[PDB]
Design a protein around this ligand. Structure first.
Ligand code: CDL
Ligand code: CDL
Ligand code: PC7
Ligand code: PC7
Ligand code: PGT
Ligand code: PTY
Ligand code: PTY
Ligand code: PTY
Ligand code: 3PH
Ligand code: 3PH
Ligand code: UQ5
Ligand code: FE
Lengths: 269, 101, 29, 123, 100, 56, 75, 76, 488, 55
């Protein structure tokens, strides 16, 4: 079922903005530092303004998902995926789009040595995190959350200040991946009952008390690592301290919110 | 030696000749068959020439590549012509020539 | 006035035949 | 010029697998392996980094106990590499990894035995 | 009792090959010889079954297996020869450098 | 040293090409396959420097 | 819109550039090769789409036969 | 935080898995005899467990089987 | 009569072309007039051409390969499954050959016989895929194995290469004898060697109390041979030593094609035959052992080749989980895993071969690669993350199915093992990324840029790895088609 | 070995094979009892399966 929205500014273009910025920056020589800086900054700022517009056309009376649009994956149409926001995810999209230009601006002075790789990593992070916040599907929430691990790993390891960044990056990646695998197990557990991973349907299916308990434990495994809750919080000090400044900003301001967003979005309802 | 041409998957086009003779298949070669033949042979000769330059045997290498290409191209053209006569490949020309002679 | 390398000339003919035969193969299929 | 390369040079002697003694030269602060590679006593191509993670005991040398007391003791990783690289899987008590020995002024005159080279160039 | 006696003959040959692998840790030439012994035992198994079952398939495969045994021994002895040539010895301590 | 430099700088186009090809051919070796073939490849004299300029 | 020809041409151009970059050469070292790559990529993408359609067509009949064979059990 | 949780966490896990990887690597001893012996042992285990496990159930149990296997890790 | 041989046109062509190349190589390699030119690259290009023409002949003649099936029935069996398997095998052989030219000219490996032996082994694997009788299967396996023994020892003056060959020949011959013994036991118990006859005899009984111990142990011995071939634990220890000691192009070729051929054999023997739960349990336990041992041993490795060998062992464990569960989706997932692992291995070995021009040996030799060749360090990082199974890279499919089957067959110990081994694997895969991007070594190694062939192959495999999950429909459909064609 | 040693080993092997013959005769003579045990266990298993299926 094509759920294409009618509004002009939608979610897919806001996804595409930093992607296009990254592709363009792929091909510009590192000698053109000014051009790289300006292109990255402008892509991030345009994404921020786009998110502000998305706020403007928000409808604050419905309990439904707004701006819902769909993206087909197979011609068989058995598996088709939806994006949409509500009043719980809107401001997180806005916060992500707002923080990314701040990250590009913090490293403005050192960009001659940072290179285009710094801006490209942060733009890719932006694309992945906006996707994560905009997904109406457990499986795609999974796939796009794990994807941020790669650019975050690179950001911590390359531009961290000292050699402790090695251990910090290893621990970040391994803790987060362990949690993610637990929630993958939960996702498959759900799929075996329902035959689907579409969030809207799962909000209208009934789970047994027993299997609710066990699925909730499996979700908790991921989310408590993400929050973090004790005693799986010890990766956070190492990672958030050893990361570069903008890396710490993205880690604390956005990535930490993903566990609480997962609790609000899948586990509680 | 007992023989049986019968295939596992039946022909999806009219069977002009169930087991066409070798010379009949060769005489059935169309313009497209000759184009396939010539293209394969020419590519093979070119590869032989280019790969033979560094060792210094570009001529003999051309001959070897050409032999490989001749055999492969003839096998491919024969495959196509026989498959058309047997009804395994689209064979409008074969059916038209059959309904008249 | 004349290219004298016979093997080179034959290879040139083979490449031309490959190109033209490929064009004809696409066109008649 | 008040600072010379001669200030860092460390006089050394090496006994080749054929038994002949050679006087070799290295800088203080660099490894014994580098000093040995200067004259080709050990093939530089066989051990290009001075890191234990890139070592299969191609740098291995034998040193008498009089000079062994003047070196830091072998670490666990060094003994692991030496033992596994031994053909008989036996740890030689006078064996040192040349890449882990840093030359100092206190090692002036040290005598070192270079064993026969092990195969190193993996197909 | 014929078939059990013919089968246990081939079986003792196979077990002898296994034992030759087990008992020859310093002698890899005998290890190759033990492998041939196992191949001979399998060949005998095909021939006995062919007669017992009154069927020719066991005999065709026996001939082809003899061809495989010949090629195997030729290539194996070539590899033995070149190993010896490189090292000057056949002792197992000089073929243990790949490890871990 | 002047002798080898003068010899190289005065070479014609044809000799430059000949020596480029020769240098490429003898830049690497497979002595094991040569021993299988029973031949011994020798460095051509136009690639060998005189002994009076060699380090020894 | 976003046709298989355009995706394929972009992928072929990207392939040539990526190949040049891997070899530490300028992106546009041999531009006629970029044209050749765009052509080959377009051809390959169109052929892949057609092959996907044909593959689904064959899988349909084959699943039909599997279903019939299974349904023969309850006869 | 830096005590029990580290020991029952990244510090302890890294140590034990390093020692285990160490031990497993040593199995690949480089001796062709070990590799043949391993194949023979695997073949013997296959025959023993998967066909000669009919009258064994009288004296054995599956619990003890897996326990003794794990217990072997704590030897010497 | 002639038209009967349309069923074997591809094989006839490749065999004849191989003979032509053998004659060409031996005639001109011995030529004084031409000064004994090296012919490894010339014969390699001509053999790549021959492989591509074979692929054309096979792919374009799909119905014709089934012609005269009754006449050919007691020799082989060609169907859709064999069709796609053989096409994939030829594609892998073509890629592996294309990756060899820099090795030929820069090392000066002048032996053209290397290419001939590769082509003959490809002939053997082609016949392996279509084998439909124990005799034919054994003969094709032996042809393939003898070719590998010879090429593993091709550096005949190297200690490493000669050691690899010796270990391979001894352990290969032992395993082949075990498999042949199993075949003899099955024949003696059933009077049959053709796969159809075996299917008819064995179906409906499995272990109905009065079980043929001859049939049960024949199956076991054949399974042991198969597990040796797929390098499954505990029949694996030949693989790391052989992979490391062989010439790197040999290692690349052995890492891919034999797996395809032997898994075709395993599907058509076991899946199409019938002893049943015992054998799926065999592959279940070997899968778990392979995952655990591969993860730990790979974590121990300091050298690139050994790391990749142990990685392949772990991945065959992941793949065999699909065979174990015994469902259409299990077979499909096994095929998807084989295809994706093959493409990733081709990518990894293209990088390794490119770096062998400067004699890469240790993981630490990759230090500062993100500085000396940024796009190469990124490409290699994508391969590692794909090996780790990080989504949305192509490698994520195998992980997803591993857990799908763990919750589908109903196996939670398997899921726990998968979680732990996946995390261990991710650690030792991202260690390489750390070495290329995070480390600041005192001494750098500067690598020579790769040739055009490897750059193009790398570029295409890198787009596939990054973008496969955007358009995965053709692989899914073709693998479902193949899984179904095994029984219908 | 000594020639007499080889001959004595051959004699010992001959004795071993005659003993194996006796073993085969023993195994053949106990086919009926093994069949009876198999049948009684099959009856027990079938009765248990039928009884448990009653619930
Ligand atoms: C109705 C039937 C009637 C039969 C009547 C005959 C019965 C005979 C009974 C004899 C037993 C009682 C003996 C009492 C003591 C005798 C006194 C004595 O010992 O002094 C002898 C004295 C040595 O005695 P010794 O003090 O014990 O010293 C022993 C070693 O020196 C010790 O040194 P070592 O410790 O270092 O050992 C090294 C090794 C040397 O290394 C070896 O490998 C030994 C050689 C073995 C293989 C050699 C053959 C393969 C080589 C190829 C040959 C060509 C192949 C093709 C041609 C032949 C094929 C047909 O020496 C040995 O191992 C010797 C072991 C002998 C085993 C082989 C003989 C048995 C063959 C099977 C016979 C089958 C029938 C008898 C059984 C019947 C059923 C019970 O000198 C001699 O023996 C004279 C040499 C002439 C011998 C000729 C024998 C035939 C040779 C040609 C034929 C080869 C094939 C064999 C037949 C194949 C059949 C198909
Ligand atoms: C009433 C009539 C009276 C008139 C006629 C009398 C005729 C005379 C008697 C016949 C001959 C007996 C005496 C033999 C020669 C003794 C004189 C002598 O100087 O020997 C020196 C000899 C020194 O050795 P050598 O020859 O100089 O070679 C030196 C180097 O080894 C050479 O280097 P190499 O490279 O050539 O060889 C390497 C290695 C070669 O390595 C080996 O050969 C392995 C040695 C261990 C053999 C293990 C058994 C092999 C026999 C097969 C048995 C069945 C196996 C089944 C296994 C599969 C089942 C899963 O060397 C050795 O290890 C030598 C060890 C020799 C020990 C042989 C012991 C045989 C086992 C006897 C067990 C008895 C149990 C009885 C019941 C059996 C169950 C049915 O030292 C001895 O005295 C040992 C030999 C005496 C015992 C062996 C003969 C046993 C015969 C028993 C009588 C038959 C009973 C059954 C009757 C059935 C009737 C129905
Ligand atoms: C005035 C309007 C007409 C303008 C025409 C422009 C058309 C040009 C289109 C570009 C064609 C590109 C073809 C790329 C292949 C390069 C062919 C080549 O290099 O020629 C070579 C080799 O040629 C061949 O072996 C086969 C290919 C030749 C066939 C294509 C020739 C293109 C022009 C056609 C000329 C023939 C037309 C008349 C034929 C009777 C000559 O021999 P060697 O010097 O020994 O080769 C050395 C190695 N290396 C390749 C690196 C140069
Ligand atoms: C979101 C995915 C999930 C997470 C995984 C992320 C994986 C990457 C990790 C992200 C962290 C940062 C990564 C930084 C990489 C960006 C820098 C980069 O790769 O730039 C390359 C650029 O690499 C490339 O070449 C990429 C090419 C890929 C082509 C893909 C595009 C396909 C269609 C485009 C069509 C052509 C261009 C159209 C416009 C002209 C430059 O390479 P050099 O080695 O520096 O120099 C190359 C040599 N020379 C410049 C002279 C040519
Ligand atoms: C030949 C050497 C075999 C061991 C001999 C040691 C003395 C006797 C110990 C023994 O009892 O052997 C047991 C061997 O124990 C084991 O094999 C260990 C079990 C496996 C443990 C690990 C599991 C691997 C998976 C089998 O028990 P059983 O003798 O009572 O069997 C008799 C039969 O039931 C009635 O005829
Ligand atoms: C009811 C109460 C429940 C409580 C909740 C429990 C939930 C789990 C809590 C524990 C979470 C553990 C997560 C793993 C973090 C490991 C991080 C270690 C990585 C690190 O810091 O350094 C490495 C350690 O060395 C290494 O070699 C490390 C090897 C990799 C080890 C990863 C193994 C994790 C597998 C999962 C185990 C837990 C299973 C849970 C079911 C590298 O150091 P280096 O210097 O040697 O390397 C060469 C350097 N380039
Ligand atoms: C699916 C994801 C998306 C993929 C996108 C695909 C898009 C289509 C690809 C577009 C390609 C763009 C570039 C086209 C122009 C390049 C033309 C090559 C010219 C050429 O003759 O190259 C020769 C070498 O052969 C070669 O280098 C070519 C062989 C290289 C290997 C290619 C594959 C062959 C074997 C098939 C493997 C299949 C593997 C599957 C498992 C000589 O080059 P030179 O003159 O520079 O001198 C090299 C020194 N000797
Ligand atoms: C076994 C075979 C294995 C092959 C694996 C799949 C090919 C490799 C995938 C990785 C490279 C391609 C990435 C996918 C392109 C991203 C856009 C996907 C897309 O929707 O475009 C459609 C596919 O184009 C394309 O065809 C994709 C480019 C060709 C690749 C064209 O859309 P369409 O309408 O023409 O096709 C019917 C679709 N609704
Ligand atoms: C297929 C069934 C049997 C299979 C096994 C047997 C196959 C036959 C043996 C094949 C072995 C390779 C034969 C190579 C012959 C080279 C002859 C020679 O020296 O040529 C140099 C000789 C003289 O040139 P030169 O090397 O410049 O002196 O001939 C040529 O180079 C002629 C070049 C023009 C040929 C172009 C057309 C080729 C089309 C295919 C024929
Ligand atoms: C490894 C095996 C080595 C032996 C070589 C096997 C293949 C070479 C066979 C050559 C004889 C083919 C023949 O005479 O058939 C025509 C021939 C027609 O005779 P015509 O009417 O006088 O032309 O066909 C027949 O009637 C005889 C059939 C013989 C069986 C053929 C088996 C091999 C088929 C593969 C052929 C590949 C393409 C070559 C065809 C053109 C050859 C001129
Ligand atoms: C560190 O301490 C020590 C050990 O302890 C790790 C040792 O062992 C040994 C020596 C003894 C050994 C190595 C015997 C073990 C050999 C075996 C089990 C042969 C099989 C070979 C391999 C590689 C094991 C693979 C098989 C597995 C994982 C399971 C089998 C298959 C299935 C379940 C399907 C020593 C000296 C030691 O000092
Ligand atoms: Fe060292």
């Amino acid at each position: 079922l094509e759920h294409f929205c009618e509004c002009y500014f939608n979610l897919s273009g806001l996804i595409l903005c930093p992607v296009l910025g990254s592709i363009i920056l792929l091909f510009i020589p590192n000698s053109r530092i000014r051009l790289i800086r300006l292109i990255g900054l402008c892509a991030s700022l345009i994404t921020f303004l786009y998110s502000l517009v998305l706020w403007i056309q928000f409808d604050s009376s419905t309990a439904k998902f707004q701006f819902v649009e769909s993206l087909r994956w197979l011609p068989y149409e058995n598996i088709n995926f939806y994006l949409g926001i509500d009043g719980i995810s809107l401001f997180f999209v806005i916060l992500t789009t707002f923080l990314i230009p701040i990250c590009i601006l913090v490293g403005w002075s050192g960009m001659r040595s940072y290179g285009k790789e710094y801006i490209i990593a942060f733009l890719i992070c932006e694309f992945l995190m906006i996707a994560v916040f905009c997904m109406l599907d457990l499986l795609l929430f999974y796939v796009f959350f794990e994807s941020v691990l790669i650019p975050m790993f690179i950001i911590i390891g390359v531009w961290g200040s000292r050699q402790r960044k090695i251990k910090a990056a290893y621990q970040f990646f391994l803790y987060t991946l362990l949690g993610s695998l637990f929630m993958l197990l939960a996702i498959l557990l759900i799929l075996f009952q329902t035959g689907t991973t579409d969030l809207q349907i799962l909000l209208t299916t009934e789970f047994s008390e027993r299997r609710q308990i066990f699925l909730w434990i499996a979700f908790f495994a991921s989310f408590a690592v993400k929050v973090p809750m004790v005693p799986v919080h010890i990766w956070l000090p190492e990672a958030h301290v050893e990361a570069p400044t903008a890396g710490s900003v993205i880690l604390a301001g956005i990535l930490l919110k993903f566990g609480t967003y997962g609790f609000l979005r899948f586990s509680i309802p | 030696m007992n023989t049986d041409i019968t295939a596992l998957e039946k022909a999806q086009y009219p069977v002009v000749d169930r087991n066409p003779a070798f010379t009949k298949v060769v005489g059935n070669f169309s313009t497209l068959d000759y184009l396939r033949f010539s293209t394969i042979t020419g590519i093979s000769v070119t590869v032989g020439y280019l790969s033979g330059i560094k060792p210094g045997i570009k001529g003999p290498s051309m001959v070897t590549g050409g032999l490989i290409g001749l055999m492969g191209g003839f096998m491919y053209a024969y495959q196509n012509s026989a498959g058309r006569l047997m009804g395994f490949f689209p064979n409008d020309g074969e059916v038209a020539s059959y309904q008249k002679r | 006035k004349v290219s004298e390398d016979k093997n080179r000339n034959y290879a040139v003919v083979a490449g031309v035949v490959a190109i033209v035969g490929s064009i004809g193969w696409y066109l008649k299929a | 010029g008040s600072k010379k390369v001669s200030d860092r040079i460390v006089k050394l002697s090496a006994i080749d697998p054929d038994g002949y003694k050679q006087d070799i030269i290295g800088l203080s602060g660099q490894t014994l392996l580098r000093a040995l590679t200067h004259t080709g006593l050990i093939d530089p191509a066989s051990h290009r980094l001075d890191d234990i993670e890139a070592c299969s005991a191609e740098c291995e040398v034998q040193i008498a106990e009089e000079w062994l007391e003047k070196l830091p003791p072998r670490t666990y990783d060094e003994e692991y590499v030496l033992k596994r690289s031994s053909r008989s899987r036996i740890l030689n008590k006078h064996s040192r990894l040349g890449c882990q020995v840093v030359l100092t002024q206190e090692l002036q005159g040290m005598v070192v035995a270079v064993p026969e080279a092990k195969p190193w160039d993996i197909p | 009792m014929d078939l059990i006696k013919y089968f246990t003959f081939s079986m003792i040959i196979f077990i002898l090959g296994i034992w030759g692998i087990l008992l020859n840790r310093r002698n890899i030439l005998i290890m190759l010889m033990s492998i041939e012994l196992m191949l001979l035992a399998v060949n005998l198994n095909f021939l006995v079954f062919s007669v017992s079952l009154d069927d020719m398939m066991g005999q065709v495969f026996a001939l082809l297996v003899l061809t495989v045994a010949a090629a195997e021994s030729a290539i194996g002895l070539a590899i033995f020869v070149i190993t010896f040539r490189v090292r000057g010895t056949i002792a197992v301590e000089f073929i243990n450098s790949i490890q871990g | 040293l002047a002798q080898i430099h003068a010899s190289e700088n005065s070479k014609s186009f044809e000799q430059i090409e000949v020596e480029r090809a020769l240098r490429k051919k003898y830049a690497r070796k497979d002595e094991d396959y040569d021993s299988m073939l029973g031949i011994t490849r020798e460095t051509p004299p136009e690639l060998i420097l005189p002994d009076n300029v060699l380090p020894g | 819109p976003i046709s298989a020809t355009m995706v394929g041409a972009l992928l072929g151009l990207g392939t040539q550039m990526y190949s040049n970059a891997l070899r530490k050469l300028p992106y546009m070292r041999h531009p006629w090769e970029h044209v050749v790559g765009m052509g080959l990529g377009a051809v390959f993408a169109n052929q892949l789409v057609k092959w996907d359609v044909k593959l689904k067509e064959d899988l349909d009949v084959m699943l039909a036969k599997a279903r019939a064979a299974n349904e023969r059990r309850y006869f | 935080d830096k005590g029990a949780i580290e020991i029952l966490g990244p510090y302890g896990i890294s140590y034990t898995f390093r020692r285990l990887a160490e031990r497993i690597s040593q199995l690949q001893s480089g001796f062709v005899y070990h590799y043949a012996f391993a194949m023979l042992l695997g073949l013997t285990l296959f025959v023993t467990f998967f066909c000669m496990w009919d009258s064994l159930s009288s004296w054995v149990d599956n619990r003890l089987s897996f326990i003794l296997i794990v217990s072997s890790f704590y030897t010497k | 009569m002639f038209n009967l041989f349309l069923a074997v046109f591809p094989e006839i062509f490749i065999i004849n072309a191989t003979f032509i190349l053998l004659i060409h190589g031996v005639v001109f390699s011995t030529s004084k007039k031409y000064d004994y030119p090296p012919l490894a690259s010339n014969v390699g290009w001509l053999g790549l051409l021959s492989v591509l023409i074979t692929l054309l002949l096979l792919a374009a003649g799909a119905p014709l390969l089934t012609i005269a099936h009754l006449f050919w029935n007691n020799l082989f069996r060609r169907d859709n499954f064999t069709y796609f398997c053989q096409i994939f095998l030829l594609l892998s052989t073509a890629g592996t050959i294309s990756m060899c030219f820099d090795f030929f000219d820069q090392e000066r490996f002048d032996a053209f016989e290397f290419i001939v032996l590769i082509l003959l082994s490809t002939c053997g694997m082609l016949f392996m895929i279509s084998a439909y009788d124990l005799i034919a299967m054994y003969l094709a396996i032996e042809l393939q194995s003898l070719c590998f023994y010879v090429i593993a020892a091709s550096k005949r003056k190297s200690e490493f290469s000669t050691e690899a060959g010796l270990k391979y020949l001894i352990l290969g011959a032992f395993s082949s004898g075990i498999l042949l013994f199993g075949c003899s036991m099955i024949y003696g118990s059933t009077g049959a060697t053709h796969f159809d006859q075996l299917a008819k005899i064995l179906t409906g009984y499995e272990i109905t109390g009065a079980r043929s111990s001859g049939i049960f142990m024949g199956i076991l011995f054949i399974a042991v041979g198969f597990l040796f071939k797929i390098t499954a634990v505990p029949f694996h220890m030949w693989a790391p030593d052989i992979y490391e000691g062989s010439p790197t192009p040999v290692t690349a070729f052995l890492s891919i094609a034999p797996k395809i051929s032997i898994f075709a054999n395993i599907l058509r023997v076991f899946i199409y035959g019938s002893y049943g739960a015992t054998l799926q349990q065999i592959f279940f336990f070997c899968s778990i052992a392979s995952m655990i041992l591969g993860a730990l041993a790979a974590m121990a490795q300091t050298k690139v080749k050994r790391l990749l060998a142990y990685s392949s062992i772990g991945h065959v464990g992941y793949i065999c989980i699909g065979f174990s569960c015994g469902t259409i989706e299990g077979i499909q997932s096994l095929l998807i895993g084989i295809f994706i692992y093959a493409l990733m291995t081709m990518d990894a070995f293209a990088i390794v071969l490119a770096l062998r021009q400067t004699r890469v040996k240790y993981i630490a030799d990759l230090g500062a690669l993100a500085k000396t060749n940024p796009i190469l360090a990124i490409t290699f990082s994508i391969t590692m993350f794909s090996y780790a199974g990080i989504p949305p890279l192509a490698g994520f499919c195998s992980k997803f199915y591993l857990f799908f089957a763990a919750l589908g067959c109903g196996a939670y110990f398997l899921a726990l093992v998968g979680v732990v081994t996946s995390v261990i694997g991710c650690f030792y895969y991202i260690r390489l990324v750390k070495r290329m991007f995070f480390d600041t070594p005192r001494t750098w190694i500067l690598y020579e840029p790769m040739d055009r062939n490897k750059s193009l192959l790398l570029a295409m495999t890198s787009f596939f790895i990054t973008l496969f999950l955007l358009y995965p429909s053709p692989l899914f459909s073709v693998t479902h088609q193949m899984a179904l064609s095994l029984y219908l | 070995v000594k020639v007499l040693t080889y001959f004595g080993m051959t004699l010992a092997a001959f004795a071993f094979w005659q003993s194996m013959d006796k073993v085969h005769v023993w195994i053949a003579l106990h086919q009926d009892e093994k069949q009876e045990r198999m049948e009684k266990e099959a009856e027990v298993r079938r009765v248990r399966a039928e009884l448990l299926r009653k619930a």
